[PDB]
Symmetry: D2
Subunit: 152 residues, 4 copies
C-alpha cells in the first residue's frame, strides 16, 4: 500500500498449537469446495480447498498428514449462493501435542460436521459481515493449527 | 450499493436471543472501561476510540443493575493494540451471557475480568485491528460482536 | 494491522499542486453535506464537509481561504440513498500557482456543478464500486490540492 | 451478501458505449504487456499478476487488428509498484478510445505509449495498490477500470 507491492488481508487465528510444516494458501475471492480428512480416535489429517478466483476454480495444494488411516470428507458448496457463516471445532491433546481435533462448517444452507473428535477446548468464529477467502496453518501428523483470511 | 461504508464484523459471542447498542467503526482503540461481578458476569462496557488522531468517547453501555466492579484499560495508543480477545459465555439466572473477558495486547495481558466458567471463546488476530464493538446489555452483557479492519 | 494500532484506508490523489496549510479530515462512514466556495475569476476557496459517522452527523472543520469574496455553495445530499459516483474538475494556474479551479460532483440522482472556472487541465474520478469517505489537502489563497479516502 | 469477495473499483476511463474483459483482483502486479500505434491508440493489454507469491499470467486481451508496437513493462516486484496511471482519451475513427498510457512507479516512469492528445486523465495513489484491470477492447482499448486494494 505504502510499503511494498503486496496486497494485505485481515487474518484471524491461529487456533491450535504454537509448535509440523507450515502452509499458506493465501487469499482468493471465495470458496467452492473443501476437502478434509479425520480419524475419530485422533484429529484432522488433511485440508485441501478449491477456491474461487475471479469467477473460476482454483485448486489449492493438498495439505496432507504424514500418516495414514483417515476418513475423507468432501464439502461441495452451492457456490456462490452458499457460503460459510461460522467455523467451529475443538483443539486438544493427541500424543502430547495440541492439535485441531474437530471441525464444523455452518453455511446459510446447511451444517457440515462435526468431523472428528468433539473433545477438548472449543472455538468458534461466527461472521456477521464478510467472507472467508483463504486458509493457512501447519500440518505434520495432524493439523496443528490454522488461521483464516477474511474479506468483504 | 448504499451510501454507508462497511467493515468485516465477527460474532456475536454470547446469547442468540437487553438493550442493543452499536458503536460502529473507528480508527482504533484508546481505552476500554468495563465492569464485572466475580459472582455473575460482565456489566458495563464503554470504549474511548480513536477517530483520525483524536479521542472519541463512545456511549456508556450500562447494566440495569448495580454492584459491579469498574475496570479501566488505558492502552498506549498507537504503539499498543489488542491482538487477542478471549472469554467465557454461560448461564447466569436463566440467560446465556458473557461471564468473562480478557484482552491480550502486544505489550500486556489484561484480565480475566469476571467468572471464567462456561464455554470458552477466543479471537486471535494475525493481521488487522479491532475498530468497534456492538452487542446487547440487560442485567449483563448478553452478546457482543467486533468490527475488524486493516 | 501488524505495525501500529491505526486503521488504514485507500487514498487517491492529490490533484492540484505539489507546493498553503495542509488539512486532513481523515476517514468516516459516508457523506451527508458538502460546503464549498468559488470565485468565477480564480479558483475554489473553501471546503467543509458534514460526514456520516456510524449513523450520525459529524461536522468537519471548515477549511477556509485567507482571502475574501468567494461565492458559497451548499450541497445537501439525500443521505444515505444519494451518494457521489464521480468527482471531476480542473486544475490550473492562478497568480503563478497551480490550484484547483473547478469542482463537479455527480451523484446517482443529480450533477452538482461545475463550480468555479472550467479552464486548465481536467481530472475525473469515476467510482464503479466503493464510496468517498474523507477528504484531505491544502488551502492557502485557494484550494491547492486535494485527495480522497475510498472505502467499501 | 453473495459468496464473492469485493474490492474498490475506479473508472471507467474512455468510452461510455469491443470485447469486454475482467481479470478480477489479485495480490499485485509483476508485469504489464501492452501495444500501441503512434498514429491511433492502445491495442493489446495483458498483465502478469502476483497471486499469493507466484506469477499468474492473465489472459491476453488483443485488438481485432494488427500493426501495433509491443511493449513489456517488467516491474521489480515486490519493491516496485505503480503509484500513478495517466493517459489520454479521444476520438479515433468515430470511437472514443484510450489513446495513451503512462505508468509511474516508485522507481521509474514508463511511457507515454501511444498518442498524447484528447482529454487527459490521471489516477495518483497515496495509499493502496492496483490489483486488477477490466475494460473493453475492439480495434483499440475502448475503456478500462482498475481494482484498488490495501
Amino acid at each position: 500500500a505504502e510499503q511494498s507491492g503486496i496486497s494485505q488481508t485481515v487474518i484471524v487465528g491461529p487456533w491450535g498449537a504454537k509448535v509440523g510444516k507450515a502452509f499458506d494458501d493465501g487469499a482468493f475471492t471465495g470458496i467452492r469446495e473443501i476437502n478434509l480428512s479425520y480419524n475419530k480416535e485422533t484429529a484432522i489429517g488433511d485440508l485441501q480447498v478449491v477456491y474461487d478466483l475471479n469467477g473460476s476454480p482454483y485448486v489449492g495444494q493438498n495439505h496432507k498428514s504424514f500418516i495414514t488411516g483417515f476418513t475423507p470428507v468432501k464439502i461441495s458448496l452451492d457456490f456462490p449462493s452458499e457460503y460459510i457463516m461460522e467455523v467451529s471445532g475443538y483443539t486438544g491433546n493427541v500424543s502430547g501435542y495440541v492439535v485441531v481435533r474437530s471441525l464444523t462448517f455452518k453455511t446459510n444452507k446447511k451444517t457440515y460436521g462435526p468431523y472428528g473428535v468433539t473433545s477438548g477446548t472449543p472455538f468458534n468464529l461466527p461472521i456477521e459481515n464478510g467472507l472467508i477467502v483463504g486458509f493457512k496453518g501447519s500440518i505434520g501428523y495432524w493439523l496443528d493449527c490454522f488461521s483464516m483470511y477474511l474479506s468483504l
